[PDB]
Design a protein around this ligand. Structure first.
Ligand SMILES: N[C@](CC1c2ccccc2Oc2ccccc21)(C(=O)O)[C@H]1C[C@@H]1C(=O)O
Ligand SMILES: N[C@](CC1c2ccccc2Oc2ccccc21)(C(=O)O)[C@H]1C[C@@H]1C(=O)O
Ligand SMILES: *[C@@H]1O[C@H](CO)[C@@H](O)[C@H](O)[C@H]1NC(C)=O
Ligand SMILES: *[C@@H]1O[C@H](CO)[C@@H](O)[C@H](O)[C@H]1NC(C)=O
Lengths: 767, 767
């Protein structure tokens, strides 16, 4: 029964426009709707009527095709829209009074969803101009749905893009609870993980929550205020006003950067009285090019002339509160009559989604045109393959369609039947006096963000990067995981020996290698040289040189005077073995102090093994001779004893072959030593000790022999001193790391005491 | 325009019955349906007409309420059903010619789903009588849906229940591919995991697959034929025929137990010609009580009398291929006329879902009655709160409704708007000759399965339990995981020392504990006793006794004759120390061989430490005396030497305090020994060795002293033998576990050789 605005045509596009207000709870079953909507309603019906006239008058597309329409009141309520959609469907069915080819979707998403659920069963393509819910992106559930508006998912995309632009990490996130805000925050946090942006706490409040509730929410948000300053509300306007109430009450303004979605977009009524409260906030609007087409088509519309629109007349009486008695719709509500002088241009503000409506209409027109060109390239009108027009092929054409819209830019439909995003970023800035207002600060389009950074803050004193992680020191400071968020670093330095393995992971490289200046990596420290002017090495060298000079002098003296009683007092043949042993022992000091080559690794051990063994073998033979007392015999004994230690050295070579060892006293210290282990040093020392104990046993028996001018007494004393020195320096050797120096001093002083205690009396006597 | 069977009433229940056949592809847009369905169609319209008359005539419920109906052709096709549903909805809307309160759902599930998608938007409760798809169980998607039939999920439940009853694990599973079979197999495998039933391989074929494809499927199934014998097909009849073609071709019958869902339920046409092919198969049907109500209401229906049903007349001409020229529906298709004598009782077979239709009708009637009683307990007719009847409250009543159905049992609606399952299990058994047919073998109801096991196989020679895991041996056989399925055990035995920790997991308990007979657990083996009649212990005891007798005799003899030259030859005072040492050493043997008590742990070590040390201390003093040669002095030396070893024992007690050790030579052997470690045995042995070496050194000097009638020579020889024995038995001690026995023999023989070599000559001389 309800009146339908019917424009005649050949291919007939239906539409649902929210002409009347939502009926209250009392008339949900009767379904008597409220007052006529001005901005959302009749503007749109006039829009499509004029648009269809223009398309009818445009030879550019659909040449011999006339497009009619039916406008049915949608009342912004699901029930009424469903009634009207039923009327559409039955008309189309009984047609098979004319079949509806497609339909322009209702405003609200919560209504468009149900209308889609109904239309999906009859292959009726629907195009929406206001449905922005992202649950309509599915094609499993809503196959026949087309949007010239981007979903709220793309609002979330724009917000995350601008946050990325301003380089923030630890931002707070609140959202209105319901269909809108909840899903919006889900999308936002979905697209946050792809950017590494952290979220403080996904707070969730109503628009009807108490002032106390709002204050509690503000306190909860401010709990992390020092760290988190940018609060993204996927918020309704009333939520914004609630938060502003809370901010004025708590007085915690300034740090709270209110980044809002399409809530307080341009709606200053949201923030009237609270201009100072939320200055510097960032919001988003849909791009709405003011279309002059409708301005010209609409401002010249008088009630009498505009006969085609049925309720328009009625609208007049409500628009101006005047009762046009002359007009058939002589409503008794208004007292005064309507003056002919009263025009419509006054207070004329067109809807904020006018571009979208026109875009949807052209979208369907171009869909039909594309399908016509695909299937009817013959007759300029309706071909054979179009007479039973089917929704499947029309939707197929509509998926793969594009054109320049009335707005100015192109309209593309992706896989999910969504137009690309087209947003304007705006800031609630303050003027000179208390006249704060909204100003455009750039645009967001299809992914590319063109913001005007210089416009906001007017300087480089913006809100600090809300982050839980200050940039770590490039030296050794490594990130940690506090377990709270994914961007809360405690830049604790790595170990002195560690390097920067990763940004979040630290490691220390292999032994010997030490990190660089900035711990970029690590490098191997040079090995020790062991030929130095160090006091201890030079002291050893001086001692060895003095010993060599003394040995050479005494050797020469004893070789020349080989018949004197003083020389005859001792073995005039076996002393050469002593001299050779002593000289080799002295040269051992020089052997150790050099570059520790493989050949040197051989020679050093060879010398330090042979020379002491040889010397003490001669000593033990001499002591045995003395014991016999109180010479082609003892030579063989001495040779065998020397060969014993030579065999020991050979066996040690066989067991553990020498190689140039990179000795590591620490990990930050690298020295170069041969592979002489504990066994490799003890074994020669063991044999030397055995010979020394033998000498001690065979000489202690003759501790008090003053023969040859007090010879044996001083020899015994010196040997006791030598034994004491050996037993004292063995632990000093093992309890230190200056191994080469210790061996040098030990052998040098051993030979020195021996030579200086057995030969100095002899030299003094002879000269 | 399409003719609607309209029964007048006050509360009007619509219905959709598949009156005509599905229109072919050529007339999907024209929507001209095919021939009139007999079994599925007009039976049901007559059913509901008579049922509504009866409910109208029953004062038991809805006293002053008359129920009308509209029957609209459903044509088994989605498009026609949607057209008719649109008509219903528009009638109901314009009513607000009379409002439809509810609707009886279309037959097919693929049609009921779409009709539900349409009706959900208008609060129109729908009850289905044939929709068995389990995607309709959801209430998120299909809120206003009621089923008097159970879903296919419950067919899967029944199959899994019977498999559980017959106790099978490793069963093959095949399913028709599509809406039916795929979802059915999903449900079956869902409910299999709750029972631990394994699946061979979820094979998936069409009903249109080639004979080659069917043969390939049969080969794939038979690939596991020895292990898996029961093949559950959630199968269409054509799939069954395909599998039977394959079975006849391959000739792999017998082992293949065809457990089928509602495919070849009673449809012998599926298995005609293949009676021998799939004997012994198990199938399921919906319980269909043959309702005599409809039999009486329907058999007395003549075309002329039955004016209320519009197409019934037409049905007549198609039912009998006679053209009733007299009747207004004088179809020209049939040549012959209709004889008045021609009745309808011939070949009368009612539909297999008659009970379900009547149950649905009564279900809606009882829903209305319950809601009436809930809201209108006043006027016997329509109260105030019912005039604008709403679907929400009607569905609320329908959810919480129950009654005794026409079938005989109750109808309950759970949370998901589903009636409980009611199935009859049937077997394709063989008669005497080649006359194999279906026979009922029990029922399944709401969860309780009442099968007739004795009916099937007629003996205990059923199909073997198709399992991958034979029952493991109760001893130590543990299950494994081959990685193929969750019930493929290889009953490998556990370790000899292991126990049955779990059915699938094995473990071995703590040390010492050994498993029981059946490895139920483990128990601690008793410790060693070490007081035995074993040959070696008894030999030690005999030796010790002989030694004690000899020692006592010689002690007495030497005490009496304490002045003889033979006795005077040795120390006539120090020999008492020797005798006491020897006797204590002998008693050590008895000390070791007993229960190893804590006090015994003390005493044994004390003795074995003191006695040898004391004896050898006296020996070393004697040897020192001899060395002085070649007495209140040596007594103190001996006492000090004894106290040395006593202090050694005390220090060993301090370091490692004795405790009763459960010694474990192996894990299956438990002995009881003190905590005498290597150190605790070597230290006394070390001291003993030191004294022995001292004795050797001091006696080897006097190896050839024939004084006192060849005394020292034999003593030296015996001491050499003793040293050899010690050096030989130390490794024998360390290279064995008979520690107590070894110590006993060592000490006993040491004392024996000592006594028998130092004293036997003396005794022989004196007597
Ligand atoms: N964009 C709207 C608005 C929208 C929204 C989207 C989804 C769910 C709820 C919901 O309600 C709110 C609340 C606050 C801000 C914007 C929205 C749409 O419905 O698509 C737009 C037609 C609606 C209009 O202009 O009134
Ligand atoms: N039980 C049915 C039957 C059914 C089924 C269920 C779901 C999807 C497909 C489908 O097709 C098959 C194929 C073989 C066996 C049974 C089914 C139902 O549609 O509910 C029953 C009304 C259908 C009838 O009697 O024809
Ligand atoms: C982070 O943002 C700042 C401006 O706030 C700017 O330096 C740049 O966009 C980002 N930083 C770097 C190092 O690129
Ligand atoms: C497994 O099934 C068999 C009959 O096939 C029967 O023993 C019983 O139901 C099950 N087994 C046991 C041990 O209960």
């Amino acid at each position: 029964r309800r009146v339908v605005a019917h424009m005649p045509g050949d291919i007939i596009i239906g539409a649902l426009f929210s002409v009347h207000h939502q009926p209250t709870v009392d008339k949900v079953h009767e379904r008597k709707c409220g007052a006529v909507r001005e901005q959302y309603g009749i503007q749109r019906v006039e829009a499509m009527l004029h648009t269809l006239e223009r398309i009818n008058s445009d030879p550019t597309l659909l040449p011999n095709i006339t497009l009619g329409c039916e406008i049915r009141d949608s009342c912004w309520h699901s029930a009424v829209a469903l009634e009207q959609s039923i009327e559409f469907i039955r008309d189309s069915l009984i047609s098979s009074k004319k079949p509806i080819v497609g339909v322009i979707g209702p405003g609200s998403s919560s209504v468009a969803i149900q209308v889609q659920n109904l239309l999906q069963l009859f292959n009726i393509p629907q195009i929406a101009y206001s449905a922005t819910s992202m649950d309509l992106s599915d094609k499993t559930l809503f196959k026949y749905f087309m949007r010239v508006v981007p979903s709220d998912a793309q609002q979330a995309r724009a917000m995350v893009d601008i946050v990325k632009r301003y380089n923030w990490t630890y931002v707070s996130a609140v959202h209105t609870e319901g269909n809108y805000g909840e899903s919006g925050m889900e999308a936002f946090k979905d697209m946050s993980a792809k950017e590494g942006i952290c979220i403080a706490h996904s707070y969730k409040i109503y628009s009807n929550a108490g002032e106390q509730s709002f204050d509690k929410l503000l306190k909860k948000l401010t709990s992390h205020l020092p760290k988190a300053r940018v609060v993204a509300c996927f918020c309704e306007g009333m939520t914004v006003r609630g938060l502003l109430m809370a901010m004025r009450r708590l007085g915690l303004a300034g740090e709270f950067l209110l980044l809002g979605s399409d809530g307080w977009a341009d709606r200053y009524d949201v923030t009237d009285g609270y201009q100072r409260e939320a200055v510097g906030g960032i919001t988003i609007k849909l791009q709405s090019p003011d279309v002059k087409w409708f301005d010209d088509y609409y401002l010249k519309l008088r009630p009498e002339t505009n006969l085609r629109n049925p309720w328009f007349q009625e609208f007049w009486q409500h628009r101006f509160q005047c009762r046009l008695e002359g007009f058939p719709q002589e409503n008794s509500k208004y007292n005064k009559t309507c003056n002919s002088s009263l025009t419509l241009k006054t207070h004329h503000v067109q809807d904020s989604k006018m571009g979208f409506v026109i875009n949807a209409i052209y979208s369907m027109a171009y869909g039909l045109h594309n399908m016509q060109m695909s299937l009817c390239p013959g007759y300029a009108g309706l071909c054979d393959a179009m007479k039973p027009i089917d929704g499947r092929k029309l939707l197929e054409s509509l998926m793969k369609t594009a054109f320049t819209g009335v707005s100015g830019d192109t309209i593309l439909f992706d896989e999910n039947g969504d137009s690309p995003g087209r947003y304007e970023i705006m800031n609630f800035k303050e003027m000179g006096k208390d006249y704060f207002d909204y100003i455009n600060v750039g645009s967001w389009d299809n992914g590319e963000l063109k913001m005007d950074d210089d416009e906001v803050w007017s300087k480089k004193s913006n809100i600090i990067r809300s982050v839980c992680s200050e940039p770590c020191e490039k030296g050794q400071i490594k990130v940690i995981r506090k377990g709270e968020v994914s961007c809360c670093w405690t830049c604790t330095p790595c170990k002195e020996n560690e390097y920067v393995f990763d940004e979040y992971t630290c490691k220390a490289c292999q032994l010997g290698s030490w990190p660089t200046d900035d711990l970029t990596g690590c490098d191997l420290i040079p090995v020790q040289y062991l030929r130095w002017g160090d006091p201890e090495p030079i002291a050893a060298v001086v001692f060895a040189c003095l010993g060599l000079l003394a040995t050479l002098f005494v050797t020469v003296v004893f070789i020349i005077y080989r018949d004197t009683p003083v020389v005859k007092s001792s073995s005039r043949e076996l002393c050469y073995i002593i001299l050779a042993g002593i000289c080799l022992g002295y040269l051992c000091t020089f052997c150790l102090i050099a570059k520790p080559k493989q050949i040197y690794c051989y020679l050093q051990r060879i010398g330090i093994g042979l020379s002491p063994a040889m010397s003490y073998s001669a000593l033990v033979t001499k002591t045995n001779r003395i014991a016999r007392i109180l010479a082609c015999a003892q030579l063989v004994i001495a040779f065998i004893l020397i060969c014993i230690q030579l065999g020991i050295i050979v066996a040690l070579f066989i067991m553990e072959p020498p190689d140039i060892m990179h000795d590591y006293p620490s990990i930050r210290e690298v020295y170069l030593i041969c592979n002489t282990t504990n066994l490799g040093v003890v074994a020669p020392l063991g044999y030397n000790g055995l010979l020394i104990l033998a000498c001690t046993f065979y000489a202690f028996k003759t501790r008090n022999v003053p023969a040859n001018f007090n010879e044996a007494k001083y020899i015994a004393f010196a040997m006791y001193t030598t034994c004491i020195i050996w037993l004292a320096f063995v632990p000093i050797y093992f309890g230190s790391n200056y191994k080469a120096i210790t061996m040098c001093f030990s052998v040098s002083l051993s030979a020195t005491v021996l030579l200086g205690c057995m030969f100095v009396p002899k030299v003094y006597i002879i000269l």
